[PDB]
Amino acid sequence: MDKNELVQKAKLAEQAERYDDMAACMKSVTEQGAELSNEERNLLSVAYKNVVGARRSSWRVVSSIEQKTEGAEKKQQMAREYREKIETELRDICNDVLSLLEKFLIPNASQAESKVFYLKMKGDYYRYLAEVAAGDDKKGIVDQSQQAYQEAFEISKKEMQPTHPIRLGLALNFSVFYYEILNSPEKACSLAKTAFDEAIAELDTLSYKDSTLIMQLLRDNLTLWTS
Amino acid sequence: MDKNELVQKAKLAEQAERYDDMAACMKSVTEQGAELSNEERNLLSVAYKNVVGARRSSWRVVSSIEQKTEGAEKKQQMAREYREKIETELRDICNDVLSLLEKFLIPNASQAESKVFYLKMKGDYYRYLAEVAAGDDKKGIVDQSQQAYQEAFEISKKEMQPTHPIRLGLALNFSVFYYEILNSPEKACSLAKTAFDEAIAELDTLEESYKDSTLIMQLLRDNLTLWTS
Ligand SMILES: [Ca+2]
Ligand SMILES: [Ca+2]
Ligand SMILES: [Cl-]
Ligand SMILES: [Cl-]
Ligand SMILES: [Cl-]
Ligand SMILES: [Cl-]
Numbered sequence: 265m266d267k268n269e270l271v272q273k274a275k276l277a278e279q280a281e282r283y284d285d286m287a288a289c290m291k292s293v294t295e296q297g298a299e300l301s302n303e304e305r306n307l308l309s310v311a312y313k314n315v316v317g318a319r320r321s322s323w324r325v326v327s328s329i330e331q332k333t334e335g336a337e338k339k340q341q342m343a344r345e346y347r348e349k350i351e352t353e354l355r356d357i358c359n360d361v362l363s364l365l366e367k368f369l370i371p372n373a374s375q376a377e378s379k380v381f382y383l384k385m386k387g388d389y390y391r392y393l394a395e396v397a398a399g400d401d402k403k404g405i406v407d408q409s410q411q412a413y414q415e416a417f418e419i420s421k422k423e424m425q426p427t428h429p430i431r432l433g434l435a436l437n438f439s440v441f442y443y444e445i446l447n448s449p450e451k452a453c454s455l456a457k458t459a460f461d462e463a464i465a466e467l468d469t470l471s472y473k474d475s476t477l478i479m480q481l482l483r484d485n486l487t488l489w490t491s
Numbered sequence: 492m493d494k495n496e497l498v499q500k501a502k503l504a505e506q507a508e509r510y511d512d513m514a515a516c517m518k519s520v521t522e523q524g525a526e527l528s529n530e531e532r533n534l535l536s537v538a539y540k541n542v543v544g545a546r547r548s549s550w551r552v553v554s555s556i557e558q559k560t561e562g563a564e565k566k567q568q569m570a571r572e573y574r575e576k577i578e579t580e581l582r583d584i585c586n587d588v589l590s591l592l593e594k595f596l597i598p599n600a601s602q603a604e605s606k607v608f609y610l611k612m613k614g615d616y617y618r619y620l621a622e623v624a625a626g627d628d629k630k631g632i633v634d635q636s637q638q639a640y641q642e643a644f645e646i647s648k649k650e651m652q653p654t655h656p657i658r659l660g661l662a663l664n665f666s667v668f669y670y671e672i673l674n675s676p677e678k679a680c681s682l683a684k685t686a687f688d689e690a691i692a693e694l695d696t697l698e699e700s701y702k703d704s705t706l707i708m709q710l711l712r713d714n715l716t717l718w719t720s
Pocket of ligand 6 (some may be wrong): 504508510
């Protein structure tokens with residue numbers, strides 16, 4: 265399977281909702297070492313989002329059951345063991361994505377748009393590791409997530425317009441990092457509100473649907489977190 | 492791996508929407524050789540329905556895309572080879588289930604209700620093989636589906652009330668077999684209509700678990716509406 269063929273396969277897999285197949289294809293395209301097109305970048309992101317997402321969803325159910333059963337040490341041990349099984353799958357997915365980002369995607373990123381996208385992505389996957397991390401390793405994983413988001417944030421602020429969907433998307437995920445991982449709701453609200461207001465101010469420079477959708481998500485989090 | 496632990500793992504897997512895991516647990520439960528409870532056979536059924544379902548849905552997308560490629564032999568060979576990969580996964584799942592049905596489930600079925608349930612299931616999984624079958628094998632696959640359903644149909648008419656959810660569910664799936672596999676719309680409609688009408692008549696003449704029965708009745712009528720253009 266050569267590049268164009270692997271991309272058409274990934275697109276078939278997407279249509280079939282066979283996301284592990286989709287991820288395998290785009291991993292192989294990425295490993296050929298050439299900078300990904302915008303289309304290929306999105307295919308990779310969609311694939312791994314769904315692959316990791318399935319495990320995250322499962323983890324939340326099994327972790328919720330574990331702690332909603334007071335006593336009954338046979339059933340709690342089972343849920344704990346199944347959570348751990350799911351965690352191993354999730355960690356290996358995140359480490360595969362994070363290895364692709366270090367080796368290929370971030371160093372080859374020749375546009376600010378691309379570099380911000382991949383650094384945001386690095387922040388996300390370290391955040392998914394942080395969701396599942398045990399106390400000892402957690403602080404290091406959380407700092408790795410924060411630094412990836414922060415570098416992405418610096419670059420988008422300098423290079424991209426406030427209405428750009430990748431700049432707005434970064435503000436959404438980084439604000440979520442602050443609220444959910446760092447337990448810093450004031451910082452989360454400040455980041456979200458600033459991104460929203462700066463986008464509102466610069467509505468002259470737009471081209472659209474994605475941008476205003478993310479702005480709505482930002483304000484929804486503000487109202488949720490304010491109450 | 493004791494029976495009770497495996498059942499609780501299957502329930503965890505179900506909540507996690509990890510249906511391969513769920514099917515593996517219930518496969519192991521079934522292979523211990525003891526007759527399954529109502530709860531256990533439903534867990535087995537739900538697990539495998541979802542496991543095969545994923546591949547069936549994927550097959551319909553990739554098969555459609557293969558037919559939609561008018562003039563592109565490179566993209567069409569790709570779609571065909573991916574369909575074939577999906578088909579082999581699908582057949583292996585169906586044959587797993589059908590093997591559990593022959594070896595353990597149908598032999599140990601001590602009640603008419605469970606006999607009908609497992610024969611319907613046999614009909615379903617041969618029907619899924621029939622959906623994916625090429626001309627050579629298809630006639631034999633289709634006949635095994637029909638014979639499984641037909642035996643289930645006869646036992647259900649003799650032993651169960653018209654409003655029993657298993658009897659109604661059989662009528663639904665058997666009518667779908669006639670419509671989609673044998674292309675016999677008139678037989679599909681008549682089977683589905685008499686099942687609906689006989690259930691409606693039984694509500695007047697005296698039913699316990701309304702919900703499942705009445706839901707299947709709605710699905711029977713929906714098919715009758717769809718199949719009459
Ligand atoms: Ca998959
Ligand atoms: Ca699964
Ligand atoms: Cl897959
Ligand atoms: Cl998948
Ligand atoms: Cl699974
Ligand atoms: Cl699944």
